[PDB]
């Protein structure tokens, strides 16, 4: 059995979230939670919330056991960008992109 959890339209760059996603790919859930608790990054909080949601879904909707779960898949994709205007010198204007991402976590007992 595989169980999914997602966070869509998250306020961060995919490049920045992938750095933290790469630390927990293929680990046991307890080990992964310990790793996330001691990473001084903002993406760690978001990733940790998603992992906790996935574990709760596996317990409640599928009758799973916590001690047998592993992080079988994790990935981050790009989302829409918001466009803004920032003035510069001598009356010239630039464009600013505000990037977002989607985060997906899959836990399994096999």
């Amino acid at each position: 059995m595989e169980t999914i959890a997602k966070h869509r339209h998250a306020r961060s760059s995919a490049q920045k979230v992938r750095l933290v996603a790469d630390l927990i790919r293929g680990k046991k859930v307890s080990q992964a939670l310990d790793i996330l608790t001691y990473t001084n990054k903002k993406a760690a909080v978001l990733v940790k919330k998603v992992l906790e949601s996935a574990i709760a879904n596996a317990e409640h909707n599928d009758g799973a056991d916590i001690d047998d779960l592993k992080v079988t898949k994790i990935f981050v994709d790009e989302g829409p960008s918001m466009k803004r205007i920032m003035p510069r010198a001598k009356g010239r204007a630039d464009r600013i992109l505000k990037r977002t991402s989607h985060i997906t976590v899959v836990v399994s007992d096999r």
Binding site: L19, V20, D22, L23, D34, I35, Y38, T39
Partner: peptide, 10 residues
């Protein structure tokens, strides 16, 4: 060269 390092043990 940009990968992060995890804590060895607690």
């Amino acid at each position: 060269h940009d990968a992060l390092t995890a804590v060895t043990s607690l």
